[PDB]
Amino acid sequence: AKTALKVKAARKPKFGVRAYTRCQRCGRPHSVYRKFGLCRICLREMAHAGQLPGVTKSSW
Amino acid sequence: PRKGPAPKRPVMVDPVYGSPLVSQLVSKILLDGKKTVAQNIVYTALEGCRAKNNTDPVQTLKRALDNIKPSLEVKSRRVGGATYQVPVEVKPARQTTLAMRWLVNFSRERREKTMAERLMNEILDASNGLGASVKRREDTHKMAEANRAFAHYRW
Amino acid sequence: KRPAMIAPGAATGRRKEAIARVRITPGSGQWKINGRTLEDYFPNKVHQQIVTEPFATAGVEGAYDVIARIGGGGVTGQAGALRLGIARALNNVDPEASRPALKKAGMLTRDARVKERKKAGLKKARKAPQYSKR
């Protein structure tokens, strides 16, 4: 994402309702999980690389 | 399929009347996966049957099924540049299935209000020898007789 | 050939995500499933046969009481689990006079048929979205 957008999201919003999430590794604004920050792609790649404890592929 | 004849699931018997025929009838009605609704309909129809005639409802259902059972039916054939209607004899299981399907469909098509004794009326009419199901059986047999000249294409 | 044995016993039954704790005991043949009677808990004859018929195919008949604790599943699954539980109870009570017929009737067997899981890209376990070429 754009650096200005990332810093604006990081800073406290004017009105509480105006805040949003952003991928904390990636800056992506779509599909950001509250449990661990990050995003769709960041989750997939980091879970594959094994930096997320407890997270493994599910094949039930 | 290519591999071979797939196994057939065994047919259970009706707890009340003790005949696999009624179980097949309810499984053929059996719309939307509502077994209880379907067999409530079927039991109501059979009880209406035994009400209007003293004979056994399972026996009258059997007689209707024999009156609707087709003996031979024609299928499309792609020989040459024109399609043929080759008559083929019908096995007992296939003809019971056809009779049940026709009974249920024409019961659904009947003009009366409720499905239960639409099916009851259709069953009684078929057992007597009348109705849309018997008419369709006669029409299919008639068309098989008309196209009887292609009985030598059977394989 | 012998008319089996009456004898108390107990077993467990499972079918389609439903658990059936069955305790069969000598008695008149009445039923009590989760406190309520058979005609209350299985209100209709749709699937009372499936639970009664273990006795019918065994030597004993409706002169032998049973107590059932039933959990999970729907009505039909609970019926199947209870049937398997009664069959297993009769099995482990008389494994010689009722075992052959009881197993031949396909009743000392638990069907593993369970709801298949949904799959990504499909509307249901196997139903697929409507393919639309061009």
Added chain:
Amino acid sequence: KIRIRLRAYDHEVIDSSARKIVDTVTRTGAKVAGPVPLPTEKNVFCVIRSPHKYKDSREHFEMRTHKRLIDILEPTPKTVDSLMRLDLPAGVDIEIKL
């Protein structure tokens, strides 16, 4: 009396930690209820595999939290000091309810 809740992501380290706790308290007398396993928390995440325009192919992940419970029936303040001072693997946490 005296609850010990163990939570981790690997049941091997959960079991090893529970065995270490029970063998420690026992080495300090204190008879203690066996490690009882609680249901495992099962979180599921579905993720579009591709970075763009490919939604029908997805990847599923789980974060399984394994939990075990220990009861220290015997008060045994010596075991209290032991259970507060011993060292456990980093992956598993400990919760002591006095």
Added chain:
Amino acid sequence: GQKINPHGFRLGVTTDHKTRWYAEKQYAELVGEDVKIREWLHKNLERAGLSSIEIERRSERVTIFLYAARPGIVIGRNGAEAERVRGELEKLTGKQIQLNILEVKSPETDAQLVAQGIAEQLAARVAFRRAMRKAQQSAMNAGALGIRIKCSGRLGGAEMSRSEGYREGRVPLHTLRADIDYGFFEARTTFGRIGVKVWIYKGDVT
């Protein structure tokens, strides 16, 4: 294009997670600091050669295992560089960092360092075929049961992109009990960057 990451595929089965901590109300922020730590270490310690960064946490205390081929760069002179990197780590995170640096017994057998070296040679403009053959030969001299290297990109500074690969021995990617070490690096050239992937079949594990 359609192959799974071997490490993610075997995660939990044969290989283990690089991070070992438990937290259920801070999970995201600990993940963020871990990302910061890993990015900082990778960006500032290319010269040492990083096999893996392993993070542990006990209570507001972080422990970093740095698996490096040549920890001489990390330790500097009498631990001066180690102290400075630790201090930068407290500056970055705000927590007590205990940093320890470990060797790799067979850098020619660890895939990540192999990709490191191949990408370094490609950046230094060595013929890619010669580099891949050297890495393969060194791996089998060490005693790996199977090597597979693939360099994709504008190989040799060309215009079209190629996907040139080498392999011999056995690399059963589909076998879960197979211990397969996977490494990847990017050679930063005057012509974009080359992706170098390395699979090394260490052996079979239970």
Added chain:
RNA sequence: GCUCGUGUCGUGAGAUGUUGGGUUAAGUCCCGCAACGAGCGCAACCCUUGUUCACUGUUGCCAGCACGUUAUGGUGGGGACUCAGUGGAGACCGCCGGGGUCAACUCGGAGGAAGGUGGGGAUGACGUCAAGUCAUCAUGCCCCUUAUGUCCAGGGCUUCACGCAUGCUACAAUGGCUGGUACAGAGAGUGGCGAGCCUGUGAGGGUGAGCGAAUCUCGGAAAGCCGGUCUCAGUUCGGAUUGGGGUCUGCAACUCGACCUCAUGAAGUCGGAGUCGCUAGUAAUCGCAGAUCAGCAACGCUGCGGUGAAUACGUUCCCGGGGC
């Protein structure tokens, strides 16, 4: 399926292996063979489900024992049952018989929870399509630099003569309405899940325990069964649209939110040519939960269980693919 090393054949590209006979879901094996070998794929190792044993017994369970306000495993207590979750056992054509030159395989049977791969998932070979993504990220080169940077308010991404596509609700009586009454699973929760009581027709509001949760809450499962009623009516079907009065979230619901209530009651009578999904706990249907999320246009998506079919003679034809 795709290949390799060596050998061999050919001037050579190349071939042989990898053809042939049999078999298999499978380049799966067997037989013969200028081939002898190996590798990536197949299979297995992994997850889940079906049987069972040991271990443990709370927040789970209650067979035998003692009370409980009447009452609630509420209680002491119990390892029996269920379950929870760790570690084992179990299936291998292993046994029996036939076929199969034998041999792989194949048929039948017994035992068994399960029999010939038991069901499902993960796993996608060499490569193809200059397939998609410079907008997740990263980056070669080019371009912008008092603007193509960057901040803000308002607007737009929600337009509407139309066309296509994926769905939802329907067209009713296997149904609508109404009262009563059964049976789930998988999940989520501290700016959260919120019980109970009071208030309102209701959305909700006011108070407000409990629970970081096998404990407390979401919670009601719905279909179904049972009683009543409607009686084939463009309807007591359908619920679009439109008028009024509201609630909640939010700095703020005009453009452009969901919901409640009152009124309104559109098309729709089962859909042309054509076309789609599915071989069993499947299709069909019935509800439930989660992600994102202040709220929500979600009927979407990913899961979960409930009820639960019909049919497969067969390969001639249509589509895709495999060996020679």
